[PDB]
Amino acid sequence: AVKKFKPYTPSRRFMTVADFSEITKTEPEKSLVKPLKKTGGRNNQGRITVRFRGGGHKRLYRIIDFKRWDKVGIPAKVAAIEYDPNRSARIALLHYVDGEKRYIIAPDGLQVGQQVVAGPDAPIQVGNALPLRFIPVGTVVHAVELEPKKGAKLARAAGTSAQIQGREGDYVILRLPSGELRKVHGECYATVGAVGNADHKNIVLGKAGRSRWLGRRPHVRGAAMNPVDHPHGGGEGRAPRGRPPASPWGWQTKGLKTRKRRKPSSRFIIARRKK
Amino acid sequence: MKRTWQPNRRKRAKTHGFRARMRTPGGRKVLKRRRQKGRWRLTPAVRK
RNA sequence: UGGUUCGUGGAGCCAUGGGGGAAUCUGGGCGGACCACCGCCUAAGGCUAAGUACUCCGGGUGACCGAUAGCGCACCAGUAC
RNA sequence: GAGCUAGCCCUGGCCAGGGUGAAGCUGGGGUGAGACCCAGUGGAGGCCCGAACCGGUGGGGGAUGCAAACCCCUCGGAUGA
RNA sequence: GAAUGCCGGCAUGAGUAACGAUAAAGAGGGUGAGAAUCCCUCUCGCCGUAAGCCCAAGGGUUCCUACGCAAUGGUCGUCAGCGUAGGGUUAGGCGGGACCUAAGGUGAAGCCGAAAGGCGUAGCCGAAGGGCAGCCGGUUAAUAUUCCGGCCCUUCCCGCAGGUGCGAUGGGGGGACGCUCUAGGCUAGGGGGACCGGAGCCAUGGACGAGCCCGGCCAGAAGCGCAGGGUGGGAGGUAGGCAAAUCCGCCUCCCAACAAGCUCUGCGUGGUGGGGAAGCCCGGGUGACAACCCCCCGAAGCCAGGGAGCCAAGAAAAGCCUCUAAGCACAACCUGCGGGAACCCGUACCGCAAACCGACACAGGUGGGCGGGUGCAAGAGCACUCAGGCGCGCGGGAGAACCCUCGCCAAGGAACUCUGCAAGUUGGCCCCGUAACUUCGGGAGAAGGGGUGCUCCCUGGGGUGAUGAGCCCCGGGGAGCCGCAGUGAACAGGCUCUGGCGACUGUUUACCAAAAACACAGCUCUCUGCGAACUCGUAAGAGGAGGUAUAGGGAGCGACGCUUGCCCGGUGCCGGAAGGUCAAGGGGAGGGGUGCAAGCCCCGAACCGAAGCCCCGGUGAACGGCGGCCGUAACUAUAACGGUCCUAAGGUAGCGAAAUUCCUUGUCGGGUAAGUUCCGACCUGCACGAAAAGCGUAACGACCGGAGCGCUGUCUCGGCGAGGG
RNA sequence: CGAUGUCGGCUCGUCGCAUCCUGGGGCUGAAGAAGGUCCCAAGGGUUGGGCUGUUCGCCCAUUAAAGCGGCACGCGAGCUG
RNA sequence: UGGGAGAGGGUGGUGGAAUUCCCGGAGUAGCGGUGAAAUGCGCAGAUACCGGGAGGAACGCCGAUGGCGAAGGCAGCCAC
RNA sequence: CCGAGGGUAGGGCCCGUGACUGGGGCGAAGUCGUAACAAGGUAGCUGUACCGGAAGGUGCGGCUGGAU
RNA sequence: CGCGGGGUGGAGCAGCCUGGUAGCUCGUCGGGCUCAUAACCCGAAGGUCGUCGGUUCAAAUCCGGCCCCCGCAACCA
Ligand SMILES: [K+]
Ligand SMILES: [Mg+2]
Ligand SMILES: [Mg+2]
Ligand SMILES: [Mg+2]
Ligand SMILES: [Mg+2]
Ligand SMILES: [Mg+2]
Ligand SMILES: [Mg+2]
Ligand SMILES: [Mg+2]
Ligand SMILES: [Mg+2]
Ligand SMILES: [Mg+2]
Ligand SMILES: [Mg+2]
Ligand SMILES: [Mg+2]
Ligand SMILES: [Mg+2]
Ligand SMILES: [Mg+2]
Ligand SMILES: [Mg+2]
Ligand SMILES: [Mg+2]
Ligand SMILES: [Mg+2]
Ligand SMILES: [Mg+2]
Ligand SMILES: [Mg+2]
Ligand SMILES: [Mg+2]
Ligand SMILES: [Mg+2]
Ligand SMILES: [Mg+2]
Ligand SMILES: [Mg+2]
Ligand SMILES: [Mg+2]
Ligand SMILES: [Mg+2]
Ligand SMILES: [Mg+2]
Ligand SMILES: [Mg+2]
Ligand SMILES: [Mg+2]
Ligand SMILES: [Mg+2]
Ligand SMILES: [Mg+2]
Ligand SMILES: [Mg+2]
Ligand SMILES: [Mg+2]
Ligand SMILES: [Mg+2]
Ligand SMILES: [Mg+2]
Ligand SMILES: [Mg+2]
Ligand SMILES: [Mg+2]
Ligand SMILES: [Mg+2]
Ligand SMILES: [Mg+2]
Ligand SMILES: [Mg+2]
Ligand SMILES: [Mg+2]
Ligand SMILES: [Mg+2]
Ligand SMILES: [Mg+2]
Ligand SMILES: [Mg+2]
Ligand SMILES: [Mg+2]
Ligand SMILES: [Mg+2]
Ligand SMILES: [Mg+2]
Ligand SMILES: [Mg+2]
Ligand SMILES: [Mg+2]
Ligand SMILES: [Mg+2]
Ligand SMILES: [Mg+2]
Ligand SMILES: [Mg+2]
Ligand SMILES: [Mg+2]
Ligand SMILES: [Mg+2]
Ligand SMILES: [Mg+2]
Ligand SMILES: [Mg+2]
Ligand SMILES: [Mg+2]
Ligand SMILES: [Mg+2]
Ligand SMILES: [Mg+2]
Ligand SMILES: [Mg+2]
Ligand SMILES: [Mg+2]
Ligand SMILES: [Mg+2]
Ligand SMILES: [Mg+2]
Ligand SMILES: [Mg+2]
Ligand SMILES: [Mg+2]
Ligand SMILES: [Mg+2]
Ligand SMILES: [Mg+2]
Ligand SMILES: [Mg+2]
Ligand SMILES: [Mg+2]
Ligand SMILES: [Mg+2]
Ligand SMILES: [Mg+2]
Ligand SMILES: [Mg+2]
Ligand SMILES: [Mg+2]
Ligand SMILES: [Mg+2]
Ligand SMILES: [Mg+2]
Ligand SMILES: [Mg+2]
Ligand SMILES: [Mg+2]
Ligand SMILES: [Mg+2]
Ligand SMILES: [Mg+2]
Ligand SMILES: [Mg+2]
Ligand SMILES: [Mg+2]
Ligand SMILES: [Mg+2]
Ligand SMILES: [Mg+2]
Ligand SMILES: [Mg+2]
Ligand SMILES: [Mg+2]
Ligand SMILES: [Mg+2]
Ligand SMILES: [Mg+2]
Ligand SMILES: [Mg+2]
Ligand SMILES: [Mg+2]
């Protein structure tokens, strides 16, 4: 339920902000934070390698448990749901009966006070993590390891989910958030439910400064530059593209596919994405 | 208006100083050449 | 591919990044594609004075300069600036 | 060579004073319950006026200058990209 | 003898321009060979959120004193930031180091690169961030939290006493955090006093007064007092914090809870140690046994790690505390007291500037703190003034033209001109009042108007205090007074209507363009399944991202509203296991050279043989493109209709003489006395048109056009006056 | 072309006469008044505005008349832009 | 008070038939379509047949001249 | 003091009029097609939506005022 | 007298390049079907190719000149 504002500035006309309604705790665990080094989109050479980055609000990285098979069988309790500025999902604080404390991505409808657990025997229940091969066909899961023990890779942003479609040997058939159909090994872990905060895509940034708060600096159209700068540069007055539309580096940017031809995971992609 | 020279002792020593020159192949050639030429000073003066 | 006078040329020889891959003198390389004949030479280990080059340095001599010349500097010059 | 300038990184600092008065909250009205209206409180905002500060709109001066871009009047932003 | 030749010398322009902010000068007395220019005294003027004071950076003796004036100083020079000499900077507590870590830099392990070298975890370096012990006065020609005085405090070593499972680079706690708004109580600072101290003063008409003028504090340990910050206690379990743990984390139990308790700061008080004005007469001395008290105002500072709200979600590490391990429990650590010990570097002086950056003693540039008073609604604004600092290193006259900056102007009032360029007008605050349109916020300070000083009288509420008086802050009514004029000086919008463009706040060609240009939220297409795509790199390695399709890259379009049509034949991209073409390689029909021969050696047809191209399809918010001639209606005219040629298909909606229209000042309407511009229409659109988007749009604009009102030296048309030249 | 600044305006003039007006005439299809056309004549005069950068031109209101050309399309070490 | 009948309404769940597409097998010269045709699709292997998979929508027989609701309107099945 | 009214400024309603523009009614014998009336040769009507020289056409749902 | 394209039955287009040939759709004329009209069905006519001049045995066709009509261009200032 995104929140609107009355039109008392030009920018307040359209700005919308998340309700923050599920958040129950407003400062993070001192033991699960560390400093997040802003890069400005520069690499170890000092060179910009991802244009238009920098100037965002200072953040602390929250360490998130993307393994969860660290603690087979140890039940935990959901102590708080929290704001995390390093991702679109909300995060949940778990107090394990161990006394150990961890953060997880907060699935949709998870409630403070309930319990979750990890392992093959775990109930099929929102918040639990199981190896894929023990989750019944048809189940909606998130935070899916792509390869066993490597870390939860897929379906992590706000509102996403994957659906379990069938089994074939050691592998399971998944429909990813992009619509692709893929084999993922059965021993890969996944968490029952979809990621929460599904309204995240309906936020309306409303002003340029808001993009500046996020670390997004203004983007310059190629058509706005000079020939030394861009394939679309130059021209007297405005100009159409006048060539197949291209990137700053010359490659074609309307339709030209770019997945590597002989990539070994091809034997594992069933159907390409949709829409 | 604000001009180009804005002195800064730490800057000067860390940019043109003896230890900066010795760290690098071209810097050692600067020192080699200025010795062969006979300069009285191999490196700018800064008071540290 | 480089080297040689050799720029693909009839293109050998010497060197070698990739692939294949021997023999111990009745063994092997060369004499400008290649074959025969006739000759020359012993690869895949190493070292080796002298004769040669140069002139920061010392001296000897100029049909060399003589203070705008001769080194940038005859002088407190790679200085002042 | 980034002691000028451009972008980013880390750590600090600065923004007189006045004006407008969002949401929420409380009370009252309303209804089956609501929506909603009124009053108070509240203090939001690339909100408004205006110094410092950051600018450089129009005009005039200057033009072997006070200055290899300055001076005077006027003017833009001033809690934010 | 010439090369705008080179180097040097010296002319000409010329006794010419100029001598660097228009803040400003006059006189007396000194000194000296020499005085507008040095010193002293009185008068005058300028700054005073500075043009005063304290820091930092940079500079490097420029500081103080004596003696000097050739050169330097835009004149002079006896003076000086100049020359010569001597002197001057004093720290356990201030700042930095013997402490911590940030970006980043470096870098045992490791990885990569022809060489040089590039990476790289930990670790090391790295500060204006963390951490940490000194405040007030006196003294020098020149230094002072540094010397001296008074009162405080820190660490290290060693000794004594009491206590304790002591012990760490290891585990944990803590350190440790944003933005806006803000409570309580204080301090800084300020205002007043009919109270307290003081050298004196009485003027020129009055005043010997509850008169004038001056000053009425500062630092301080323990203790107490006020105001705050921090903080649960106990017990049982325990598999987690990469060994251990009595610590921390988790579960349960009892008690405690807006508290209290313990702790830690700030302020006040405080033994004590200091200070102390005018005036006066030589920095000094007197004053002076100086007094040192009451009320008010009051921080952005302090208590602080305070409170609330909000989204964009707000360093690290050490010091410190707790836990234990090796070990050691003759030890070691904690607490209290005592003695001793305590190093290196900086410290002068300038510092919005004549000593720093600009070649100059250059109207420019330079980060942090203090920045007093009165009035003006407030304020760091504006005017004048305190303290303190200056009059800007050429002067004296004269009173032409002309130039700059400034003041006024009869009648007219934009007739000026490309243009109201420029300059007027308007101008703060209080009240009354306020339109189209609108996205319901706005448009709005709309427009337009009235008020504004002083005196007396009556009265309402608040803050301090005590509820009272006093002080202080908001006000309400009545009656009067003066002037041309009451925000009486200074600072302080001219307004309306209507188009074009761009939604908007923003950004730009440092130094001729600030805009309609760039950006912007938002819309669409497209690539990307994660060792992602993409980007930099030979590479290793990074960025992307400690992100995972509600994500990340590329492209175009540009809030929002209503919309975005037809063509896939060419180019692009996407899909197609057929077919055609196609390289190295495979295959070796059949040839050729040489040898007596075995053999050696060379050429080589068919056939098997990828990507790409060809071919088959898809695809427009992919590159792009979207017709011609002739005829037709019962007045004429024009063609709803028809005929035919061509195309891949012949421009739909909307808009149109336009930021686009050549003929063009198209035609008609409006506005004007008159309108090549403007506005509204029309439509034969040379040569609009739908995301190089089409048509609109409230609000916005130092953008560009057109009109009106107000007012004016812009002008008819010029005059006079001021100051710098 | 080792530089002869280029439209229009503004200011300041000066000159020619193929004369717009004023002065003197002849002819007239000149009744008068008023015209037409030609001849002599350069002394003087030859307005204010709307539009456009404009020159030019059209329009408004007047006028004795609202002349045409040259002077580097006169005049930027005189201004504008 | 005790009884009844009903596609009355809202939420969650869930069953089979059928069409389309995808994969595998098998198989060959046409399929589709109409008044008749052509476009389309098919040897790059279609149609017709079998097995598997995915996905959306609608509920055959019961069913009626039926039932319910104020009207619009309401139809697999289960529970609330 | 009030005060006819005059002046300035800004609103509200009504009437007349305006380049140009939108349809409407009417008009003896104009042009184009033939939507409706019979199953009107696609049953028609209908609310809405999109499209087209025109009547109309088509989608969705509804009515019988439909025929055999 | 800057550069292009065109002119052919009544209309709109082939033929021209490559000399011997005039073609296609509509329209017009005659007859059918119809109560009649259109549509539809069967037949028919009409063009010396803008013009003049040359080449050739022969010119719509090839080459020169003239007319008529459409289109493009006109830059540095
Ligand atoms: K040119
Ligand atoms: Mg909103
Ligand atoms: Mg609203
Ligand atoms: Mg939430
Ligand atoms: Mg932290
Ligand atoms: Mg930490
Ligand atoms: Mg990083
Ligand atoms: Mg790095
Ligand atoms: Mg570099
Ligand atoms: Mg990039
Ligand atoms: Mg970047
Ligand atoms: Mg993300
Ligand atoms: Mg979140
Ligand atoms: Mg897998
Ligand atoms: Mg969005
Ligand atoms: Mg951010
Ligand atoms: Mg963006
Ligand atoms: Mg952009
Ligand atoms: Mg461009
Ligand atoms: Mg450009
Ligand atoms: Mg470049
Ligand atoms: Mg290039
Ligand atoms: Mg290019
Ligand atoms: Mg281009
Ligand atoms: Mg361009
Ligand atoms: Mg263009
Ligand atoms: Mg451009
Ligand atoms: Mg385009
Ligand atoms: Mg193009
Ligand atoms: Mg391209
Ligand atoms: Mg690529
Ligand atoms: Mg995919
Ligand atoms: Mg600068
Ligand atoms: Mg600097
Ligand atoms: Mg320094
Ligand atoms: Mg420094
Ligand atoms: Mg530096
Ligand atoms: Mg460096
Ligand atoms: Mg150095
Ligand atoms: Mg070396
Ligand atoms: Mg030396
Ligand atoms: Mg050097
Ligand atoms: Mg060679
Ligand atoms: Mg060679
Ligand atoms: Mg050779
Ligand atoms: Mg080899
Ligand atoms: Mg042999
Ligand atoms: Mg042999
Ligand atoms: Mg050999
Ligand atoms: Mg040989
Ligand atoms: Mg031979
Ligand atoms: Mg030999
Ligand atoms: Mg030798
Ligand atoms: Mg000689
Ligand atoms: Mg000499
Ligand atoms: Mg010499
Ligand atoms: Mg000589
Ligand atoms: Mg020498
Ligand atoms: Mg020498
Ligand atoms: Mg020399
Ligand atoms: Mg010399
Ligand atoms: Mg010297
Ligand atoms: Mg720096
Ligand atoms: Mg810099
Ligand atoms: Mg900060
Ligand atoms: Mg501010
Ligand atoms: Mg107000
Ligand atoms: Mg209020
Ligand atoms: Mg509240
Ligand atoms: Mg603002
Ligand atoms: Mg305002
Ligand atoms: Mg300026
Ligand atoms: Mg500036
Ligand atoms: Mg002006
Ligand atoms: Mg200049
Ligand atoms: Mg200035
Ligand atoms: Mg000014
Ligand atoms: Mg402000
Ligand atoms: Mg402002
Ligand atoms: Mg900011
Ligand atoms: Mg000569
Ligand atoms: Mg010369
Ligand atoms: Mg020369
Ligand atoms: Mg010469
Ligand atoms: Mg010379
Ligand atoms: Mg000389
Ligand atoms: Mg000379
Ligand atoms: Mg000389």
Ligand SMILES: [Mg+2]
């Ligand atoms: Mg001279």
Ligand SMILES: [Mg+2]
């Ligand atoms: Mg002279």
Ligand SMILES: [Mg+2]
């Ligand atoms: Mg003279």
Ligand SMILES: [Mg+2]
């Ligand atoms: Mg002269």
Ligand SMILES: [Mg+2]
């Ligand atoms: Mg001069």
Ligand SMILES: [Mg+2]
């Ligand atoms: Mg001067």
Ligand SMILES: [Mg+2]
């Ligand atoms: Mg001044």
Ligand SMILES: [Mg+2]
């Ligand atoms: Mg002045």
Ligand SMILES: [Mg+2]
């Ligand atoms: Mg002044």
Ligand SMILES: [Mg+2]
């Ligand atoms: Mg005097």
Ligand SMILES: [Mg+2]
């Ligand atoms: Mg004097």
Ligand SMILES: [Mg+2]
């Ligand atoms: Mg003097």
Ligand SMILES: [Mg+2]
């Ligand atoms: Mg003198």
Ligand SMILES: [Mg+2]
């Ligand atoms: Mg003087």
Ligand SMILES: [Mg+2]
């Ligand atoms: Mg003096």
Ligand SMILES: [Mg+2]
């Ligand atoms: Mg006097």
